[PDB]
């Protein structure tokens, strides 16, 4: 019965939020998310078409007001697990890629009661890259943009928690060895526009081991 | 709390107005035909294989067309006058690669940007596998090789294709790719075909590359 | 107001087709489908494998009472388009594919104001086939036949129009240049079941170019 | 006539409304299923990795009650096609793939007037087997078990007409010779579990042609 | 007639219990107030392939995974003296075990079919190929290589989600006799982590196996 009652409130909690009366950020109605990168491994690197392959999990972070709740009005609940279809997500996209990402986690997301969902998809990722001088002392340097396909900077902004992309969980025997590896907000102007751009640009510098 | 209600405030404006204009198109038809404008940005030209004459390009295609039945006074909509929604919520034109060699590859979300005078316009990235003979792409000449988009079931009558430009943007072609472009454009054409009268529409890419 | 008559005149008709009280074929009311190949490009011929690949475009036709309609009682509408997945078609098979056949093209429906209904997919085919020859004058020949799966002979009968393959659409700069290639109906019995079923046998003859 | 189509089209869909208006099969009502191949090519031997590529028609029958009729009650209809979706099948699988299973042709089958279904997918499977010998007279040697992943022999029982693989549409140009094919059902006891668990073996022999 | 209707009967019984257990009032996975413990087990198959140009290694084995809850408990007796029964793994809630180190999408061989006994016991064993970070260097002498991949929840920390071994053994039992390497050894083992993302730790089982050319 304990456990029943558990279970009843976090679903109210969910039918509660789930038919509240989001169509996705407006320039009148903004959403920031934050995007931070680990990488896991350079897994093949391809001079022959210069395309690099990257294995990192991408986590994302945005607030939403639809999604609050007290949780003293629904046993104490603080967060709970739900489907990323469940809720609206952003459309983060490598602008490089050059074969469609492959997804190598469960699409779930975490909910917490002050509207803030985290996301963390772990992705494999083609992108453009010419790997030159990845059999040398200085290594190579490729790079490759991250941002929303069809927002501009007037509806979602990005950033990042840190410079510096989470390399705690590199694999150390991979066939390359990461010399640095850094993620920036850009502002970009494009002439096409009025309205401002923004990416995250993801440079990494590395050689084989 | 003010705040809160105004943001409730534009998201329900949002709201009523794509259950608006969803709960209102059957695509073109000879009394109703549309015309749909094309451009490319080609961002790569990723592998030329001349074992079997494919070759893997990467490129943006600009799609656009203008619906009255997506059209609104945005003052009748909290002065709203453009929103995104997924392409699977609207129709969407059939254009097709002709010669390509594998089912393209779609590197992007598929959303689209509808503003208030009913205009679409939706931007898939791709990477499309296509015929082509790859001689001479090691020389200083370069190759040539050219792939026709068009619909796939409406003739000239119901879709007439547009460019805004034969000239294919370049501004954002990879510049450590394995080939540089000498030159692409992309050009109308009208065909007349033996077995049909009515006339067929596409649109010719045509790209001149060498190695780098 | 005119365009909208012109919509609603076609929804009007969709709606009336859509709604009307087709099972498919059965042996009391069997249906006969025009085949038709045109070959665009033989792209691989494997050795170690025996596989070729080919692409071709697959034309369809069929005609059914249920899909007729008068054109001066649906102004003058005399066809539409529609998902292929919307109707009944009909499941003709590539009877030695080695792979998943590739759908290289929409797949969408043709519908005329007497019922018939026409669809043409593009496709890559992987398919049995011994390349041995292929580099000399005389070339090597494969065939591949193609029918219903599940329908025998008694619901789906199969026609063509022409026995000679249409080659003018086919690559000029392939690897491979076709010597001959036809489609020609065949009846075949197999043991686990009674009844004939029908194919249409593409036989193509080809060599490095 | 196009009242005698509509009234024949009108008997299979009320028969079908009628039919799919079973929760799988238990101890207390079992289910014989079986189970016959057409090998039609050995396509690949894989020495590097020991896997070997079939492809082949996989013939599945089995009885219900449940979808049994009187064609004397539905315009003599004595049988239909469905799609597999539409029914319940059961879960045979290969016990050593090595790759998801590729289906090559449509997933229908027919069901006749004595509840009986036949249902007979064309796949291609990599499973796991050591080539070693295929360059020889003698050739090599590989196997493979088929059955059920979750139901007993108390729940399914396996059964073959004939231990000898259909070889009547063995790819006659295959890089491979086939030498022996046979299907052969096992039963085999567990002294942790009271109920017996059935597969069926299927042994190829096989050499360069 | 009357085997038809005994048929019917017990078919009507599992329904009418599968109707129950589904529509109670639902289970929405687990939480820090309601957790739950999955035990894991993995039965070796096969490697397929070592791959030294990308350090990839290609393996073929079953997860078993095994879970209880409340929610899916009855008494046969009311249930005509069902005692378990098979259900599409869609029907019920299942634990998001990942591999912290694929570099594919991993690959499901089997049925995804659960096995639910009336204890509230469920049994789960999809067979998987996965691709992970491995390093072969070594494969080809009699020492052989050494690899490890983690397996884990997603989403669900150790306040939601504990993971367990019965055994450190992993079962090679089933193992390929003529694969391109044999194990010399393989075990599974239980590990706490932290990570940079969350305060909380994540549990996962960490799968190691010794191989070499056969
Ligand atoms: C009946 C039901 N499903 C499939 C078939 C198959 C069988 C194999 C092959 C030939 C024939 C028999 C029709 N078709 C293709 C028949
Ligand atoms: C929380 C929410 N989404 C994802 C995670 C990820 C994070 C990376 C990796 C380890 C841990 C933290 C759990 N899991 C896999 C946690």
Redesign the interface.
């Known amino acids: 019965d304990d456990?029943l009652h558990?279970?009843?409130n976090?679903?109210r909690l969910?039918s509660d939020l789930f038919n509240r009366?989001?169509?996705?950020p407006?320039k009148?109605?903004p959403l920031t998310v934050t995007l931070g990168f680990?990488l896991?491994?350079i897994?093949?690197a391809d001079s022959?078409?210069?395309?690099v392959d990257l294995?990192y999990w991408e986590?994302q972070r945005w607030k939403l007001?639809?999604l609050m709740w007290d949780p003293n009005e629904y046993?104490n609940?603080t967060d709970?697990?739900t489907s990323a279809a469940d809720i609206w997500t952003p459309?983060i996209?490598?602008y490089?890629?050059?074969?469609?990402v492959?997804?190598?986690?469960?699409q779930?997301?975490?909910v917490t009661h002050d509207g803030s969902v985290?996301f963390?998809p772990?992705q494999?990722l083609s992108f453009?890259?010419?790997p030159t001088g990845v059999d040398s002392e200085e290594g190579a340097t490729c790079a490759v943009k991250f941002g929303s396909?069809?927002?501009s900077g007037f509806?979602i902004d990005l950033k990042t928690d840190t410079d510096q992309v989470?390399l705690?969980?590199y694999?150390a025997?991979?066939?390359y060895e990461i010399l640095s590896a850094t993620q920036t907000r850009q502002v970009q102007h494009y002439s096409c526009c009025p309205e401002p751009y923004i990416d995250v640009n993801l440079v990494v510098k590395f050689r084989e081991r």
């Not at 009366?21 to 996705?24: E, T």
């Not at 490089?96 to 469609?100: A, G, H, I």
């Not at 492959?102 to 469960?106: E, H, N, T, Y």
């Open positions: 456990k558990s279970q009843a976090l679903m969910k009366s989001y169509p996705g407006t009148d109605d680990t896991q491994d897994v093949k022959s078409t210069n395309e294995v986590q007001n639809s046993g609940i709970f697990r459309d996209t490598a490089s890629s050059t074969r469609p492959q997804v190598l986690s469960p779930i997301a975490v985290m963390i772990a494999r453009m890259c010419d396909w069809v927002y509806e989470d705690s969980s694999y025997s991979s066939k």
